[PDB]
């Protein structure tokens, strides 16, 4: 924990809110020009944890809520998530009367304490029903996007997440009216009949310096799973798939050349860095264990 | 509404007609094609067909299968289903009767009585178990012979007889004039068992014949009452008790040489489940977006405990697809569409 910096780190400016910049970016409205504008959604660790806990706590029923944050450039930042007092069946949720009063009161109370962020989106949980936009979510997301432009639909699946051990969070945004534009068919199948109406987004997560510092001492028995990590063995299929997509991207960039090369180089660097990190861990293990009593 | 077409298809002597009968049948179907609630019409027509074919004979099987074929159009092969089965059963009964007549004429040709069987199928017809009444020894020989013949022809079928939906003729010998009776099985049995002896009390009839009390009461209600001359009794209307001393009068002056006292035919006496099924249909969807019909039905059957009939499945699927909850290009597949 020493021989480094302990003050405001380079992962804390993401948590800083600038009112003037947000006002300028809201007045600019760069989203209306290119409709494929937003492509990245950065969610805080706290927001994701709260969303997953609330979705799982609902049991087999469906739950819904809001999420705060802001928007910068080509990315949407989602910082906090607060639930709603909704009473939904196994398929549909309504949020009839007490949900909106809760929204207004909670936003006002949060602004009282110091929460300077505004509402940035809504989320609703599919209890084992995959991760896609239904014919009602599409309509309500279009309704929200028509007037409150900075918005995003987050879909979470609690049952599948708890059964498979991996979170299933999907960020989506709807195209406006009249916007038309051995390989698996899941690309069309896993979406509803409105597959051409909405498009997904790249979901990433971030955490603060204090978040990582406190989570470093979260538990002191994963060291065994790190020493006997067995890297380059549990994700070989991942690396082969990455190599295949990298070859496809290289072919596309070569066709274009005859700026697309930048993302291909980035993907290649990422895959190679992962492989080199795995080899480094294996070399460290070999030096630690097998180089003793020779 | 089907009563009109049943009466038009019924045998009526002078009612017999020509190709314009087929035209009127087509007109009836023209009035029917836009009528909703086809299930009630189909059930009523099934009952009418069973009544016309099971007991007695209709005007002609010609217009019968013509009507069946006409209902096959615009409805579907699987929708008609049973009626074609009844028609095939009647054809098989005729063929089997011809074969049995040939067999009886071939070996040990005696022919004490003239049997006429109408073997039906268990499933299609609206069957009903008989009273298990003991048959008098005159007709037991033919029952045994036909049972043996049927077992020899078809292997492993078993005959489930029904002694409540048949007719017979009795050669009465009270006095001069062989008044040929036409009776049901119960009346045949009563008269035959009364033949040996005289003046059997009602309890004696119950013991000797074995008919149920209610059916025996209904049967003995006839053979009297009408015209007050079949049997002379001091009580009128209905008066029968245990130990009653009744005997047929030793004369029958009914003024016609055709006796039909088988007049019995004339003097014959969900919301919660639908909600659960709809909820199951919705829950199966919003998951498997594109699903086949049979797969959907099997999935709902798996997800439910109580049996539920497939008709409920079909009607609820149609009702909930009417509400734009799904959409239907294969005709046996559904997309979610919300």
Burial class (CB in 10 A: 0-12, 13-18, 19+), A271: middle
Per DSSP, B136 falls in state P
Pick the residue from chain B with its C-alpha nearest to A89.
Answer: B279
State the resolution, in angstroms: 3.4
- How far apart, in whole angstroms, are the C-alpha atoms of residue B235 and residue B150? 47
Query: Is residue B300 classed exposed, middle or buried when 0-12, 13-18 and 19+ CB atoms within 10 A define those classes?
Result: buried
Give the 3-state DSSP-derived string for chain A, with helices as H, strands as E and coil as C.
CCCCCCCCCCCCHHHCCCHHHHHHHHHHCCCCCCCCCCCEEEEEHHHHHHHHHHHHHCCCCCCEEEEEEEEECCEEEEEEEEECCCCCCCCCCCCCCHHHHHHHHHHHHHHHHCCCCEEEEEEEECCCCCCCCCHHHHHHHHHHHHHCCCCCEEEECHHHHHHHCCCCEEEEEECCCCCCCCCCCHHHHCCCCCCCCEEECEEEEECCHHHHHHHHCCCCCCHHHHHCCCCCCCCHHHHHHHHHHHHHHHHHHHHHHCCHHHHHHHHHHHHHHHHHHHHHHHHHHHHHHCCCCC
Q: Cβ contacts (< 8 Å) between B282 and chain A: which residues?
A: 91
Distance (Å, rounded) from C-alpha A50 to C-alpha A46? Answer: 6
B interface toward A at CB cutoff 8 Å? 279, 282-283, 286-287, 289-290, 327, 335-338
Q: In chain A, which residues have their Cβ closer than 8 Å to the Cβ of B290?
A: 189
> Using an 8 Å Cβ cutoff, are A194 and A135 in contact?
yes
Helical pair B310-322 and B293-303, crossing angle rounded to 10 deg: 110
Q: Using what technique was this structure determined?
A: cryo-EM
Q: Where are the beta strands (DSSP E) in chain B?
A: 167-171, 180-184, 291-292, 333-334
Could you give the maximum distance between any two Cα atoms of chain B, in Å? 85
Alpha carbon distances (Å) from A186 to A134, A136, A240, B288:
16, 21, 20, 12
Q: Which of A96, A83, A160 is nearest to A124 (CA)?
A: A83
Residues in chain B: 338
* Rounded Cα distance, B176 and A153, in Å: 101
Calpha distance B119→B137 (Å, rounded): 22
DSSP code of residue B303: H
CA distance A71 to A24: 11
- B188 with B173: CB under 8 angstroms? no
Strand partners, B171: B180
Give the three-class secondary structure for B226. helix
State the angle between helix axes of B137-153 and B82-106 in degrees (0 to 180), rounded to the nearest 10: 110
Please state whether B76 falls in left (phi above 0), alpha (psi between -120 and 50) or beta: left
Q: Please choose, from the candidates B135, B96, B124, B5, the residue with its C-alpha nearest in 3D space to the C-alpha of residue B59.
A: B5
Contact A134 B338 (CB under 8 A): yes
Cα B99 → chain centroid = 24
Q: In the structure encoding, which two tokens stand for residue A263, read together? A: 């993302």
Residue of A134, A138, A197 best to disrupt the B interface, most CBs of B under 10 A: A134
Q: Do A192 and B289 touch (CB under 8 A)?
A: yes
Contacts of residue A184, defined as CB under 8 A and 6 or more positions apart, other chains included, come to: none
d(CA A238, CA B93): 71
3-state class of B330 per DSSP? coil
Whole-angstrom distance, CA of residue B292 vs CA of residue B295: 5
Question: d(Cα B127, Cα B120) in Å, to the nearest integer?
Answer: 9
C-alpha distances (whole Å) from B35 to each of A271, B5, B28, B29, B32 are: 69, 15, 11, 10, 5
Q: How far apart are CA B171 and CA B182, in angstroms?
A: 9
Q: Which of B278, B280, B284, B289 to mutate to test the interface with A (most CBs of A within 10 A)?
A: B289
């Amino acid at each position: 924990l020493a021989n480094n910096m302990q003050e405001a780190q380079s992962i804390d400016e993401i948590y800083k809110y600038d009112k003037k910049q947000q006002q300028e970016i809201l007045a600019a409205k760069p989203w209306t020009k290119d409709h494929h504008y937003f492509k990245y959604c950065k969610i805080s660790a706290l927001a994701l944890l709260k969303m997953v806990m609330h979705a799982r706590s609902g049991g087999n029923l469906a739950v819904m809520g809001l999420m705060l944050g802001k928007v910068d450039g080509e990315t949407m930042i989602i910082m906090d998530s607060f639930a709603l007092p909704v009473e939904g069946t196994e398929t549909r949720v309504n949020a009839q009367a007490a949900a909106y009063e809760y929204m207004a009161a909670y936003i006002e109370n949060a602004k009282q304490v110091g929460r300077l962020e505004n509402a940035i989106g809504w989320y609703h949980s599919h209890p084992g029903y995959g991760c896609w936009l239904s014919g009602i979510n599409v309509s309500t997301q279009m309704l929200n996007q028509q007037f409150q432009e900075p918005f995003v639909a987050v879909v979470i699946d609690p049952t599948r997440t708890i059964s498979a051990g991996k979170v299933n969070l999907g960020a989506f945004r709807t195209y406006p009216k009249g916007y038309k534009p051995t390989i698996p068919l899941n690309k069309i199948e896993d979406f509803g009949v409105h597959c051409k109406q909405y498009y997904a987004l790249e979901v990433s997560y971030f955490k603060s310096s204090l978040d990582r510092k406190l989570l470093e001492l979260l538990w002191n028995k994963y060291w065994v799973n790190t020493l006997s990590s067995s890297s380059l063995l549990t994700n070989a299929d991942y690396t082969t798939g990455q190599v295949f997509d990298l070859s496809e991207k290289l072919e596309q960039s070569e066709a274009q050349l005859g700026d697309k090369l930048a993302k291909a180089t980035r993907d290649s660097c990422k895959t190679t860095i992962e492989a080199i990190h795995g080899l480094m861990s294996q070399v460290i293990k070999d030096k630690l264990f097998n180089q003793i009593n020779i | 509404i089907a009563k009109h077409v049943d009466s038009k298809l019924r045998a009526g002597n002078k009612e017999a007609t020509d190709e314009e009968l087929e035209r009127t049948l087509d007109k009836i179907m023209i009035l029917f094609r836009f009528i909703h609630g086809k299930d009630v019409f189909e059930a009523f027509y099934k009952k009418d067909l069973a009544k016309r074919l099971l007991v007695g004979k209709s005007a002609s099987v010609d217009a019968e299968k013509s009507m069946l074929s006409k209902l096959k159009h615009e409805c579907g092969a699987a929708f008609t289903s049973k009626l074609e089965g009844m028609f095939k059963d009647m054809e098989l009964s005729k063929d089997i009767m011809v074969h049995f007549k040939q067999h009886m004429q071939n070996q040990s040709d005696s022919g004490p009585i003239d049997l006429t069987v109408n073997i039906l199928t268990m499933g299609y017809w609206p069957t009903y178990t008989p009273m298990e009444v003991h048959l008098t020894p005159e007709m037991i020989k033919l029952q045994e012979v036909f049972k043996a013949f049927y077992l020899g022809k078809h292997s492993g079928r078993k005959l489930q007889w029904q002694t409540t939906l048949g007719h017979a003729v009795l050669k009465a010998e009270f006095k001069e004039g062989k008044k040929e009776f036409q009776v049901s099985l119960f009346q045949t049995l009563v008269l035959l068992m009364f033949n040996e002896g005289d003046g059997f009390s009602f309890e004696e009839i119950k013991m000797a014949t074995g008919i149920e009390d209610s059916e025996l009461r209904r049967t003995l209600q006839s053979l009297a009452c009408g015209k007050a001359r079949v049997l002379i009794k001091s009580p009128k209307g209905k008066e029968v008790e245990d130990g009653d001393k009744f005997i047929f009068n030793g004369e029958f002056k009914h003024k016609l040489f055709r006796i039909k006292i088988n007049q019995i035919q004339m003097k014959e006496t969900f919301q919660d489940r639908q909600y659960q099924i709809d909820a199951a249909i919705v829950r199966i969807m919003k998951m498997r977006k594109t699903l086949g019909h049979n797969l959907l039905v099997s999935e709902l059957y798996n997800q439910l405990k109580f049996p539920v009939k497939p008709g409920d499945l079909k009607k609820r699927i149609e009702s909930l697809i009417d509400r734009d909850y799904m959409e239907r290009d294969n005709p046996n597949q559904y997309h979610y569409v919300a």
